[PDB]
Design a protein around this ligand. Structure first.
Ligand SMILES: CNC(=O)[C@@H]1CCCN1c1nc(C)cc(N(C)C[C@H]2CCS(=O)(=O)C2)n1
Length: 132
């Protein structure tokens, strides 16, 4: 055990209420510039900031007990124990599996969402790759 389980660029599965376990990457919050913090300053309530792979940019502060290191798509079955949501999730898994073969510096440069004030936008490199 380590007190700081994840760092910026780490790939993780995150669990948010109403959604299945989703592929993510730990990242710095646009406003705070931090990637980890204690909710209400309780040492047992550590959270990490993550961005979700998939269709549209999304991010969240998540409790460390709702995160699991991402090794691969095959973990999903053991972790558990829908139309538009399924296609978004599949797209996210393809991106996460591509990011897993990259170095941490390359995966941060390619996948980190573009921050324009408090608006989250596609990474210009991902946008160019998709022909946007
Ligand atoms: C883009 N956001 C959304 O689809 C929805 C509606 C607003 C909040 N939200 C949301 N918030 C959170 C915190 C997570 C989350 N997911 C896990 C699903 C999305 C991840 C990126 S995706 O592939 O586009 C689908 N979804």
């Amino acid at each position: 055990d380590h007190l700081l389980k994840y760092n910026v660029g780490d790939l993780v599965w995150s669990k948010v209420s109403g959604y299945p376990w989703w592929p993510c990457m730990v990242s710095a919050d646009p406003l705070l510039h931090s990637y980890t913090k204690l909710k209400g300053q309780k040492k047992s309530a550590r959270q990490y900031h993550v961005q979700f792979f998939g269709d549209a940019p999304e991010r969240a502060w998540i409790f460390e007990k709702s995160l699991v290191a991402f090794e691969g798509e095959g973990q999903f079955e053991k972790l558990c124990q829908s139309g538009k949501l399924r296609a978004q999730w599949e797209m996210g898994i393809v991106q996460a599996e591509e990011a897993a073969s990259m170095s941490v510096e390359e995966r941060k440069a390619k996948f980190t969402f573009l921050y324009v004030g408090d608006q989250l936008h596609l990474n210009p490199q991902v946008a160019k790759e998709a022909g946007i």
